[PDB]
């Protein structure tokens, strides 16, 4: 016979593909495209915060990948921190901690 393999622990929900496009946009550094996605969030088709496959939030992609423009972009438009200052401390960066002042 042949053993059948399947995702017995698939807790991650696919939801919409636009979440995946937005999460890829945070991983590429397109500031204006993520601004457009936040304008769409203001429209309301897709949410600001989406936990990915790796169990991480968008601000964690801003912090761990160490770029501050998109982090200031979601901080201007409003976003869910969800234990993100500890992640900023974890990356040993000073600037993102300073804007954050202005799983574990």
């Amino acid at each position: 016979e042949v053993m059948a393999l399947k995702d017995v622990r698939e807790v991650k929900e696919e939801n919409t593909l636009n979440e995946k496009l937005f999460l890829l946009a945070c991983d590429k550094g397109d500031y204006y495209m993520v601004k457009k996605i936040l304008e769409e969030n203001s429209s309301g088709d897709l949410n600001i915060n989406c936990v990915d496959v790796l169990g991480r939030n968008a601000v964690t992609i801003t912090i761990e990948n160490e770029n501050l423009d998109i982090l200031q972009l979601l901080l201007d438009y409003g976003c869910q921190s969800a234990d993100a200052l500890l992640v900023a401390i974890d990356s040993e960066v000073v600037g993102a901690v300073d804007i954050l002042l202005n799983s574990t």
Binding site: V2, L5, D7, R9, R56
Partner: protein
Amino acid sequence: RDRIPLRIVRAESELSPSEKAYLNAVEKGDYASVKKSLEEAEIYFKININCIDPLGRTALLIAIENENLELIELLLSFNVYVGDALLHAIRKEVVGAVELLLNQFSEFTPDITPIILAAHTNNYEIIKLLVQKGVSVPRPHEVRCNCVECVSSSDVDSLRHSRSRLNIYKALASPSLIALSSEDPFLTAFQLSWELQELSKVENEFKSEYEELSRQCKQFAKDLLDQTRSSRELEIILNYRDDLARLKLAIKYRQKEFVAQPNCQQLLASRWYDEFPGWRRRHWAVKMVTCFIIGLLFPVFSVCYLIAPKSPLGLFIRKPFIKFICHTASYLTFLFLLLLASQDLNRQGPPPTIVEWMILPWVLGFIWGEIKQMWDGGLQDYIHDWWNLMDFVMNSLYLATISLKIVAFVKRESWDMWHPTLVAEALFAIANIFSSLRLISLFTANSHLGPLQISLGRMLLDILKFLFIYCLVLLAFANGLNQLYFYYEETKGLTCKGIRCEKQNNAFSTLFETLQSLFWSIFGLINLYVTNVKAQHEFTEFVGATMFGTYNVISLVVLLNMLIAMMNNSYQLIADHADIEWKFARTKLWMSYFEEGGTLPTPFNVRAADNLRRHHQYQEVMRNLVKRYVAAMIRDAKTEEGLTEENFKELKQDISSFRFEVLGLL
């Protein structure tokens, strides 16, 4: 000629200069030139789309090792020859293999499917994508399987079959596939570790690979225990059963990494010191005083729970530490009885009631305890522990002593040497030796002497492996000395024959005396004049002397120091990680004393809804565990890692592609 001519004997394939320019532009990550080259390749030109380098670097494969998503999209757009490039994207550990999923010699084994290479590379996202596409791994056969078709496949290609089984077992033992596809990854890790151990036992070749796989599975189980963060989660995991049933399973499957976990040892120390706080915090003299007064007052707690089990004194035996203290107090009382038994003149001895009559039942209680151990575990569990073997021979000697005393009862310097009294006394002495050597197994509970005893216990195998070679050397030299020295066997005027006399004589007359003399020659207890015969034959005396000398050289100078060196290396390898072995042995002792059976020391022992709730609780807590575990290995793999040549190639090629894109724009 004085010059070696050089040429390519295996010239392989060759490329056109336009094909070389195409491949070089693909390596540079160029948009415009590569797109133009494929556009002229659409019409009839020299440039072939499926150009393969003699290095096996197709433009498809080069772009896979180039990781440029736009370039690989361009190449799949005009339908290049897709061969094994999916497996190359799997090996490169790039998430861009989904593009190939949405769409000559081979570097990989023909057995390797994408899931096997994905499990080998141990990337969570790649394996998740592959199992989301819908993929079933081939079934490996059993460790002692009997299949006619698999036997015939071994007869056709044994090498390909063995490589196939190794690849399948390497795919199954991957931690990501276990965490992603298994119902119970702890049970799967245990069963897979046992299967890999038995596979390494059966397959003497490829043993290192299977041992590495088993250690990787054990490390995965230990890491999954590391990810826990609550005593409630530990109580859910270790008490799960389909009572610390999972900890029993870890004990049985020999998971020393799982068992010696600091959190698991925290739970075990909490359960062992049942309602006994501050025992380590108090002073050493104070805690030894408390241990001495509990062990001295042993009969009052052991008489309780036999008449009044619900009494607080009856419930004092419920604590496993008090049970261990009572058991060891009973054993030192047995050894005290043996000591007073060591400290008349009749053919058959009446039973010495004063000190040697209360030993009889205590031995009977020991026999009952060993019978209860025989019932709990079968024959392999009893023969697995060497201490159960020592207890078995101790009880056999004690039963033989009792039987010989009875035979003497129903039936000095005058009795035959085969009188049952003398043999009974000798058997009692050897049983006393074994019973008092039984105390060295109680050092596992202590922290200072535990690793010492465990290291000795698992270096005894190397000691025996050396003593086999010593046995062969001893037999050879004894045979030689027998053949040389047995014509001078003295028979007249000897008040004492053998080496065990005040004046040593007849040391090498027979084989048994030669074995004894060559054994005692190690410790220097055989004098030099045992090689001097009464006759004048000085040549045979010299040959015996030089044969004794050469043996003494081989035993003392060569083999003994070889044993020292082998012990040095073995103790290095053992005390590299002997602490986990000691904690495993201490957990075995503690959990043997955790059972409700055997609560009495050897003196005085002579539903579907609940299962569904436990299953859902274990499932939820272990979704939490695997989420923490994959977060941890993603975090770990992102740091303390060398970039090496491939990362520099990607980083430089991105700047090259950016420069060419800017030059195209401007």
